[PDB]
Amino acid sequence: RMKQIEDKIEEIESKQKKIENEIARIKKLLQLTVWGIKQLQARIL
Amino acid sequence: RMKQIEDKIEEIESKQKKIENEIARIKKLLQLTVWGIKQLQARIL
Amino acid sequence: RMKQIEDKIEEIESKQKKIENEIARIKKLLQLTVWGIKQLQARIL
Numbered sequence: 457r458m459k460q461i462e463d464k465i466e467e468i469e470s471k472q473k474k475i476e477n478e479i480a481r482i483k484k485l486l487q488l489t490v491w492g493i494k495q496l497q498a499r500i501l
Numbered sequence: 502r503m504k505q506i507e508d509k510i511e512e513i514e515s516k517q518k519k520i521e522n523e524i525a526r527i528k529k530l531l532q533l534t535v536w537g538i539k540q541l542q543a544r545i546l
Numbered sequence: 547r548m549k550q551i552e553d554k555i556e557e558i559e560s561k562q563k564k565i566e567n568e569i570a571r572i573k574k575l576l577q578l579t580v581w582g583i584k585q586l587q588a589r590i591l
């Protein structure tokens with residue numbers, strides 16, 4: 457039961473890395489969308 | 502101690518699945534916002 | 547090996563909370579971008 461536990465922990469850590477990488481990508485795209493909205497605002501105003 | 506650990510793993514995995522679900526929803530809305538910005542850009546240009 | 551597991555669990559939980567908090571911040575910004583897009587739509591149309 458300790459080895460199974462260790463394996464499940466390694467899997468959780470692996471998925472946590474995936475999650476952190478996805479959050480980083482989402483933040484970069486979100487920043488681009490903010491910039492794009494601000495550009496459009498300037499062009500409209 | 503090993504039953505407490507096993508139970509805490511199951512809880513962590515549950516929370517991780519909630520997080521994954523929430524990220525999927527965020528990504529879908531973010532994609533819609535990208536489409537909406539692109540439509541505005543094309544309209545104005 | 548149970549103590550090392552318990553310490554890894556604490557670290558995983560620590561990170562999971564940070565991830566949850568970051569998702570909450572992303573959601574707040576994404577709500578503001580949706581609002582900003584709708585404002586531009588209304589003005590253009």
Ligand SMILES: [Cl-]
Pocket residue numbers: 471472475516517520561562565
């Ligand atoms: Cl997580």
